[PDB]
Design a protein around this motif. Sequence first.
Motif, PDB file in Angstrom:
ATOM      1  N   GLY J 543       0.801  -1.209   0.000  1.00  0.00           N
ATOM      2  CA  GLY J 543       0.000   0.000   0.000  1.00  0.00           C
ATOM      3  C   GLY J 543       0.838   1.265   0.000  1.00  0.00           C
ATOM      4  N   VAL J 544       0.193   2.392   0.289  1.00  0.00           N
ATOM      5  CA  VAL J 544       0.870   3.683   0.326  1.00  0.00           C
ATOM      6  C   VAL J 544       0.588   4.362   1.663  1.00  0.00           C
ATOM      7  CG1 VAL J 544       1.192   5.880  -0.856  1.00  0.00           C
ATOM      8  CG2 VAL J 544       0.441   3.874  -2.145  1.00  0.00           C
ATOM      9  N   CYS J 545       1.431   5.321   2.035  1.00  0.00           N
ATOM     10  CA  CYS J 545       1.249   6.044   3.287  1.00  0.00           C
ATOM     11  C   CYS J 545       0.624   7.398   2.976  1.00  0.00           C
ATOM     12  CB  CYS J 545       2.594   6.244   3.992  1.00  0.00           C
ATOM     13  SG  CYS J 545       3.741   7.354   3.141  1.00  0.00           S
ATOM     14  N   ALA J 546      -0.033   7.995   3.965  1.00  0.00           N
ATOM     15  CA  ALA J 546      -0.668   9.295   3.776  1.00  0.00           C
ATOM     16  C   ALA J 546       0.357  10.339   3.338  1.00  0.00           C
ATOM     17  CB  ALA J 546      -1.345   9.741   5.068  1.00  0.00           C
ATOM     18  N   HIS J 547       1.553  10.262   3.915  1.00  0.00           N
ATOM     19  CA  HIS J 547       2.624  11.203   3.605  1.00  0.00           C
ATOM     20  C   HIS J 547       3.255  11.026   2.226  1.00  0.00           C
ATOM     21  CE1 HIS J 547       2.087  11.922   7.828  1.00  0.00           C
ATOM     22  NE2 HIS J 547       3.029  12.846   7.852  1.00  0.00           N
ATOM     23  N   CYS J 548       2.799  10.025   1.479  1.00  0.00           N
ATOM     24  CA  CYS J 548       3.331   9.773   0.141  1.00  0.00           C
ATOM     25  C   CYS J 548       2.300  10.145  -0.917  1.00  0.00           C
ATOM     26  CB  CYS J 548       3.716   8.300  -0.013  1.00  0.00           C
ATOM     27  SG  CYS J 548       4.502   7.890  -1.593  1.00  0.00           S
ATOM     28  N   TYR J 549       1.029  10.137  -0.519  1.00  0.00           N
ATOM     29  CA  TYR J 549      -0.055  10.476  -1.433  1.00  0.00           C
ATOM     30  C   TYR J 549      -0.270  11.986  -1.423  1.00  0.00           C
ATOM     31  CZ  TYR J 549      -4.477  10.108  -3.944  1.00  0.00           C
ATOM     32  OH  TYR J 549      -5.473  10.235  -4.883  1.00  0.00           O
ATOM     33  N   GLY J 550      -0.649  12.518  -0.265  1.00  0.00           N
ATOM     34  CA  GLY J 550      -0.873  13.947  -0.147  1.00  0.00           C
ATOM     35  C   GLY J 550      -2.215  14.312   0.456  1.00  0.00           C
ATOM     36  N   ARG J 551      -2.879  15.291  -0.153  1.00  0.00           N
ATOM     37  CA  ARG J 551      -4.183  15.752   0.315  1.00  0.00           C
ATOM     38  C   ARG J 551      -5.288  15.541  -0.721  1.00  0.00           C
ATOM     39  NH1 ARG J 551      -5.758  19.588  -2.321  1.00  0.00           N
ATOM     40  NH2 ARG J 551      -4.551  21.156  -3.481  1.00  0.00           N
ATOM     41  N   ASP J 552      -4.919  15.065  -1.907  1.00  0.00           N
ATOM     42  CA  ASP J 552      -5.881  14.841  -2.985  1.00  0.00           C
ATOM     43  C   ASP J 552      -7.052  13.950  -2.571  1.00  0.00           C
ATOM     44  OD1 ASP J 552      -6.596  15.113  -5.890  1.00  0.00           O
ATOM     45  OD2 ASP J 552      -6.333  12.933  -5.837  1.00  0.00           O
ATOM     46  N   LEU J 553      -8.249  14.531  -2.532  1.00  0.00           N
ATOM     47  CA  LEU J 553      -9.449  13.786  -2.169  1.00  0.00           C
ATOM     48  C   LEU J 553     -10.678  14.658  -2.403  1.00  0.00           C
ATOM     49  CD1 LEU J 553     -10.515  11.167  -1.050  1.00  0.00           C
ATOM     50  CD2 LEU J 553     -10.165  12.037   1.267  1.00  0.00           C
ATOM     51  N   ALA J 554     -11.850  14.156  -2.025  1.00  0.00           N
ATOM     52  CA  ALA J 554     -13.080  14.922  -2.182  1.00  0.00           C
ATOM     53  C   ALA J 554     -12.846  16.206  -1.401  1.00  0.00           C
ATOM     54  CB  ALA J 554     -14.260  14.157  -1.602  1.00  0.00           C
ATOM     55  N   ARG J 555     -11.990  16.096  -0.390  1.00  0.00           N
ATOM     56  CA  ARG J 555     -11.621  17.216   0.459  1.00  0.00           C
ATOM     57  C   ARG J 555     -10.208  17.649   0.085  1.00  0.00           C
ATOM     58  NH1 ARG J 555     -10.986  15.118   6.595  1.00  0.00           N
ATOM     59  NH2 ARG J 555     -10.218  17.272   6.775  1.00  0.00           N
ATOM     60  N   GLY J 556      -9.827  18.846   0.513  1.00  0.00           N
ATOM     61  CA  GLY J 556      -8.502  19.351   0.207  1.00  0.00           C
ATOM     62  C   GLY J 556      -7.531  19.226   1.365  1.00  0.00           C
ATOM     63  N   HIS J 557      -7.874  18.390   2.341  1.00  0.00           N
ATOM     64  CA  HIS J 557      -7.026  18.181   3.511  1.00  0.00           C
ATOM     65  C   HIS J 557      -6.388  16.790   3.518  1.00  0.00           C
ATOM     66  CE1 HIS J 557      -9.251  21.513   6.018  1.00  0.00           C
ATOM     67  NE2 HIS J 557      -8.701  21.968   4.907  1.00  0.00           N
ATOM     68  N   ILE J 558      -5.896  16.371   4.682  1.00  0.00           N
ATOM     69  CA  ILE J 558      -5.234  15.076   4.841  1.00  0.00           C
ATOM     70  C   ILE J 558      -5.968  13.868   4.250  1.00  0.00           C
ATOM     71  CG2 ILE J 558      -4.178  13.474   6.483  1.00  0.00           C
ATOM     72  CD1 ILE J 558      -2.820  16.224   6.254  1.00  0.00           C
ATOM     73  N   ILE J 559      -5.283  13.155   3.361  1.00  0.00           N
ATOM     74  CA  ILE J 559      -5.853  11.971   2.732  1.00  0.00           C
ATOM     75  C   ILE J 559      -6.202  10.936   3.800  1.00  0.00           C
ATOM     76  CG2 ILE J 559      -3.593  10.903   2.448  1.00  0.00           C
ATOM     77  CD1 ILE J 559      -6.728  10.472   0.218  1.00  0.00           C
ATOM     78  N   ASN J 560      -7.415  10.400   3.732  1.00  0.00           N
ATOM     79  CA  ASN J 560      -7.855   9.395   4.695  1.00  0.00           C
ATOM     80  C   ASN J 560      -6.942   8.170   4.689  1.00  0.00           C
ATOM     81  OD1 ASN J 560     -11.493   9.852   4.290  1.00  0.00           O
ATOM     82  ND2 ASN J 560      -9.818  11.262   4.787  1.00  0.00           N
ATOM     83  N   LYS J 561      -6.739   7.574   5.860  1.00  0.00           N
ATOM     84  CA  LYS J 561      -5.914   6.375   5.968  1.00  0.00           C
ATOM     85  C   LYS J 561      -6.857   5.191   5.799  1.00  0.00           C
ATOM     86  CE  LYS J 561      -2.730   3.928   9.051  1.00  0.00           C
ATOM     87  NZ  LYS J 561      -2.075   3.922  10.385  1.00  0.00           N
ATOM     88  N   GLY J 562      -6.960   4.699   4.573  1.00  0.00           N
ATOM     89  CA  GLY J 562      -7.864   3.603   4.285  1.00  0.00           C
ATOM     90  C   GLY J 562      -8.624   4.062   3.063  1.00  0.00           C
ATOM     91  N   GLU J 563      -8.116   5.140   2.485  1.00  0.00           N
ATOM     92  CA  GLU J 563      -8.708   5.712   1.295  1.00  0.00           C
ATOM     93  C   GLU J 563      -8.067   4.971   0.140  1.00  0.00           C
ATOM     94  OE1 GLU J 563     -11.108   8.483   1.355  1.00  0.00           O
ATOM     95  OE2 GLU J 563     -11.371   7.476  -0.578  1.00  0.00           O
ATOM     96  N   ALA J 564      -8.855   4.152  -0.537  1.00  0.00           N
ATOM     97  CA  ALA J 564      -8.319   3.422  -1.689  1.00  0.00           C
ATOM     98  C   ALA J 564      -7.937   4.434  -2.778  1.00  0.00           C
ATOM     99  CB  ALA J 564      -9.367   2.439  -2.233  1.00  0.00           C
ATOM    100  N   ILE J 565      -6.722   4.330  -3.316  1.00  0.00           N
ATOM    101  CA  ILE J 565      -6.282   5.265  -4.356  1.00  0.00           C
ATOM    102  C   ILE J 565      -6.061   4.601  -5.710  1.00  0.00           C
ATOM    103  CG2 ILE J 565      -5.198   6.765  -2.659  1.00  0.00           C
ATOM    104  CD1 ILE J 565      -2.495   5.584  -3.553  1.00  0.00           C
ATOM    105  N   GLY J 566      -5.548   3.376  -5.679  1.00  0.00           N
ATOM    106  CA  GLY J 566      -5.301   2.646  -6.908  1.00  0.00           C
ATOM    107  C   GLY J 566      -6.557   2.475  -7.747  1.00  0.00           C
TER     108      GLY J 566
END
Lengths: 59, 49, 227, 227, 49, 149, 148, 148, 48, 581, 50
Positions: J543-566
């Motif tokens: 998987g990936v860590c929050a600190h490697c993905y960023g803030r990209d999401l429905a929201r503009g803040h911290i990416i959820n931990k368990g947020e599927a990105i692939g």
Amino acid sequence: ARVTVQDAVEKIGNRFDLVLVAARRARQMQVGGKDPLVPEENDKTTVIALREIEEGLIN
Amino acid sequence: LKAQTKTEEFDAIKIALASPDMIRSWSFGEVKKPETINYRTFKPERDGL
Amino acid sequence: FLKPRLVDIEQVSSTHAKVTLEPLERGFGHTLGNALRRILLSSMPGCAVTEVEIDGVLHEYSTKEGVQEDILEILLNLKGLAVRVQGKDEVILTLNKSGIGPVTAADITHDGDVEIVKPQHVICHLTDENASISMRIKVQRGRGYVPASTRIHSEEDERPIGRLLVDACYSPVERIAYNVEAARVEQRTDLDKLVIEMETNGTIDPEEAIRRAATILAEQLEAFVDL
Amino acid sequence: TEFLKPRLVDIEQVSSTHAKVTLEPLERGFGHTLGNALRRILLSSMPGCAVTEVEIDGVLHEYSTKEGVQEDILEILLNLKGLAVRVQGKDEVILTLNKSGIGPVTAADITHDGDVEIVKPQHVICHLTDENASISMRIKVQRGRGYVPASTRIHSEEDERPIGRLLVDACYSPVERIAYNVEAARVEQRTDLDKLVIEMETNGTIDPEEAIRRAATILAEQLEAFV
Amino acid sequence: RYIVNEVQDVYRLQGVKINDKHIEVIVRQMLRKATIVNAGSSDFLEGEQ
Amino acid sequence: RDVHPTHYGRVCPIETPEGPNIGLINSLSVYAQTNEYGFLETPYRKVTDGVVTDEIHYLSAIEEGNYVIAQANSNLDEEGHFVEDLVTCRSKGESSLFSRDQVDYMDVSTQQVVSVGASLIPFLEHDDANRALMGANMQRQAVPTLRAD
Amino acid sequence: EIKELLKLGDLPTSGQIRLYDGRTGEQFERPVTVGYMYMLKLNHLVDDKMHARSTGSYSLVTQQPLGGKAQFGGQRFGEMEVWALEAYGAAYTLQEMLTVKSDDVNGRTKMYKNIVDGNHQMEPGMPESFNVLLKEIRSLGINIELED
Amino acid sequence: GQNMRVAFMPWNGYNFEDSILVSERVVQEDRFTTIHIQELACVSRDTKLGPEEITADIPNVGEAALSKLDESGIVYIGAEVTGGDILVGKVTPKGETQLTPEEKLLRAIFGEKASDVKDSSLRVPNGVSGTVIDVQVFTRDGVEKDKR
Amino acid sequence: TRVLTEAAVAGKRDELRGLKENVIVGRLIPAGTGYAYHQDRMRRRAAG
Amino acid sequence: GRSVITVGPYLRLHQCGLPKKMALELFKPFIYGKLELRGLATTIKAAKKMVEREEAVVWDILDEVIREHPVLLNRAPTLHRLGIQAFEPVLIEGKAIQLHPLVCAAYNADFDGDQMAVHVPLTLEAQLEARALMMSTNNILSPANGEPIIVPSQDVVLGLYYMTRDCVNAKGEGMVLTGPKEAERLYRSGLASLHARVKVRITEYEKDANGELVAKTSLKDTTVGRAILWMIVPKGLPYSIVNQALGKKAISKMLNTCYRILGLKPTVIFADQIMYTGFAYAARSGASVGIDDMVIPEKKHEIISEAEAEVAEIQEQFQSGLVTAGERYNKVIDIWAAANDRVSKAMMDNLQTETVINRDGQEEKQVSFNSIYMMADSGARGSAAQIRQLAGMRGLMAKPDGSIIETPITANFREGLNVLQYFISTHGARKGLADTALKTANSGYLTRRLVDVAQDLVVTEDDCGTHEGIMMTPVIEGGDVKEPLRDRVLGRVTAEDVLKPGTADILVPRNTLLHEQWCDLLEENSVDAVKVRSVVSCDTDFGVCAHCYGRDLARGHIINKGEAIGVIAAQSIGEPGTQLT
Amino acid sequence: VYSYTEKKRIRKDFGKRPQVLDVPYLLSIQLDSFQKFIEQDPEGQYGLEA
């Protein structure tokens, strides 16, 4: 009615465990528990819980 | 912190190989008569499936 | 300020006329223009076919020996009857006809309350020599557009299964449009005039038309006044 | 014919800004025949006042400035279009504005005549610098109907031969913007109804409550020769 | 970096702007296999995560 | 599914309904007559080196693509013969230029080329035929009105 | 040819006449192309496909979907639509969609008889599908383990 | 279809290409109405127990279900059949497998067909609101049915 | 079938972790609130 | 359940409109629970009979359970995450789902037949995600960059061009203005033209401080249109952005800066109000067509005639022997295409400024009031290049063999062009249709294998341990930059400390939440190399860590931990996949 | 030229090509095959006979 609940999103950042909180809370307002303090106005208990988060009194 | 020692949520499943004894742990009867019917009375054959 | 008022109603016909308003002030040709236009275009007291019991009817979609169309299409014509009543809530118009000829709106049992404006309105035809038709057109008065489809869920307990339920189109009007022009009174700088061209098949008198509409506006403003 | 009486009228008053008037019931073309009604009445005919005529002294040029005021003279004049006034017994009345000293010349420095009803004395006519500055202007509120132009209705003063008249478009409208929302309304067991929710904002002259009242009375007046 | 420059090139004829992290999630999965080259524990040619 | 001028006079690549059965239709013509066995004959007027005879003939797909035939767009005048001295003709299915002393055929009428769904549409030459394809589908679904003006 | 016909008496050679807006009575800018054209309605009267069905009766032997094209219709939820749900940040509707909302024949029954009473929250239970695979591997010799 | 007045002018919202702006006129005057007839039928008798009857009545129902079904088990043609009203009364021989302990002996002494038969009629498919028109029925060849 | 045996042959005990896994069984995938349980289950699995 | 969508203008941005009876059939369950909770029903059987009788009782109760139900408007065929959003149902008298127009851009749909299904949240779980992370008004960002979900791309925005329109023919052009409120009331009566140039005294806010929007005095000159506009603008939005030519993407970035500088809520209120005013002016601008509004250039016919006798000259230079037969074709192709571009050089000047009107002086030249011009300015739907080949010569097409026509279409679609050449154009029709048809199918299958390989990629860790990443640079090829720095870095996490044109002064520390402000820095400095870390170099196992993905999401803040990105990426590459033939 | 029904409604024919061959039965191909199919055929007309 509510147009933006971004306030709730900030009081409790989990946005998941947040749902589990109101989960057990809706349970109290239904199966015994305790009565809803804020006098409700058409809004189901799910939305009532939403409002309690914005005030940040029950989490 | 410390978790709960009671059932709260399901868990992980282990899939490998098991012994024939492990199997027999759930056997609660030995099917004898293969025939599933009584032929006459429209009823379920005892000592069967 | 000179009170709003209508001058002599320009009457070209009994069915259709055009009201003329002289004492209109800045913007009333449009104010009343639409404030009446819409109501005049929909809600108006009219008379329309509700239930009819024809004799030779196994089913309304039948081909009666002697008529060009369906039994229901006989009712299709009945849907827009130009009947004018004087006071009855509901009335039964018997239609009996035997003999070679188009069953016009004259062979109907002419009741005192039933005042058809256009006698030659052919419903259906009876062209066979030794054939006959006999029905009772139960017409009532209402307002707007009310269909027997939205009324079919009940059956109304019908023993005389010849009581077919049909569409009650209660709209005497058809053409309502207003125009404006420079109106000139003796005492005032500028006034507007209104010419509402309203069309009625012949059920409600043009004046009684603008009468009812204005009256309903009055009642729909009753509650609106209290704060 | 069927008759339904008005029921449930939600007086949602904010006491100052606006009022959302909900009302039931409005059948086919009633949320229409009535909504449109109020719109035109509010933007075409309605007793309201505001400063129209204004004379500084002689220097009336739309892009010039008078020593003492940091703003343009023409802009002082539009602040006057905003001044909410309402005379009810006199047509046009002439006042005088005399102020000299440090501070903005508020509308509370005018000579307060009986007819003149300054509802917002807070509205600063023009800012005045820290000096003596003897600013003076013959402010003149006029009575009108809705929104009539002061660009065409230019009176006969220092306007013909010379150029010393800057009469602005007086806001004769006790309204500012009109809106409405029509959603499905009902009657215990009726079909489709429209819900009349008219939203009206006032400028600051009359309290919305009585404004809605004044309006309703005038429409009934338009039907005095009808119903 | 060339693949993202080349596939985006296709998207240049398409006028598209993608947050490159995605094009690369696809690429990372295509490289899930790391052929363990040097002889060690697993094997000498054992391909693994 | 390709279209070819060798369909001018019998098959309609134009008309082919939208949906399940699309592309594989290519309609039969009104002036079309299925032969005794399997062919189809197309009505063409015999123009003998100058005089357009009113005698209509029946050609095959081989013979059509074998002789020089004129389109329905061939200006005749006063007598019915070509007023011009040149006209666009299909030699094997290619619209080219031919002398009047070489043309052997000309299309009878402006309709001896299309079907029920093709002929039914006015000024087909102006609107696109793919809209006629979609239009093809819509034809076999016309709604029953009570009083048809 | 068209024009020759229209000048016979005195006719609107330009079928682009100026329109009076019936809303009040003003004239629109640049007269428009207006007149008689021909429409063509199809047999697509929605009353042949608008046979509303969302909740009724399912299969007996298994979770078999009974419905066609006209009557007794319903949106086909496939494995690809499953990925749509697996594609959005909404994991809760995902949970529902493949457990209680669309899986357990007992799950919805045991929950519907409570939503009609009112309780805003659900519980999984035991998917019968697993009960198949589970016992099947038992015949081979595999053990399921859930501790603590 | 039909030919009528059509104008070309965008209103921003009510006519984006395919979106057609129609006026009350049409649907209100039946100047474009289409008619639709649907068909249903009921399969016949013969059961492992005995013959069947087309109801000939309709047992233990409300007032409505009676004012429409006559002694033939059919609904009055020209009545109001909408939603899900009863059309054809269908009788079905219950069977050995369904019998009950507290009911037996009656149909062993008293009579014959006074209980063994039940009611499994057929009704109007959800989505239909018209009028039953034509009815054609046929009876038991060789050994005639009831009064029908 | 092939992949089934591909893991069974050796005994690669995959704790049923993941999306599609918890999809077929109908349980919480390790995402969002599901992972909440999983982090608590992380400390819970292979420990005591 | 399933349903069609429609207009329904009065519906606010946070609320959709469901038809009365359809709503009943789907929300029945909740009605039963609510009935025996308030104290009106006896049992579930009794409650069924209540709905069975259209009880006035349930009607009031119906109001209570629908007027505030965070529902999931889900479209099954969506090949994208943001295709599944949330709204708020309202008791609406209709036969379709009235939707708010400013959301259709996101759905890439209109009002003429879009089929959508309405999913009912049976538990508060779905309900809470619904209005929180699924609501339209709560996720105006896209996982591709800074794409605002809410944007006017219809005649509603064209309506705004009638607002911020500027012609010299305007009554009132010359006077001065002090109040935007009375400006709107100047038009509510319709006196001073909305095109009148008036000196306006505006207050402009720009929050350069720590919790304080420093404002300033500014005298500008704008039409009554922008005057009215300004009245509802939230402080956070600087006047600079709204003072322009107004276009589709222009008004798009309008709200984007508005959000990336101030916040969400002010954007919500903003969007709605503009919608209403926009439609008003769009009405006043009825864009007509049909024979009557199309025009023909005085230069078109002459240049064609030039290139007419010109090809007749090439025909003769063939009979003479100066050019080869093949080179004759291509040469003719060139000059007809030459004439084609000259046809452009005509219809564009003509249709951009020929309209002149006198006011406050002599006849000044104003932008053509012609609807074709307004379409070629803001835009709604339809390219002005095909419109160009409607009023002008279509040009060339594909031949029944494959190459390009050696005999160009010299006619225009204002008139009715010829049978034979349009018959060759019939071959063109064939082409288009077919292609679209099959490619869509295989494309969805492409994304199938895409998800088949990326579903295992879910963010499961917080921090990885890699100091590596990739070199994100504005890949400038040829002339000016093509793929910028900002839209490749926006939304991610800095791989390492990036530098400024100056050394020893970091513009973006390694550990940073990259958004607008930091990207504004990427744009105002001479920085050309900005290394940003991605999943390809992620050290995280399984998987990936929050600190490697960023803030990209429905929201503009911290990416959820368990947020599927692939998974959302397969979708987000297969999305343009449908756009590929 | 005009028959019993043409006495009431006529369609304005307008052909550019002076014709010699006039329109036949619209559904030729179909209906006459039915005639060949179900009928007395002494030789072998494509239909029940072929």
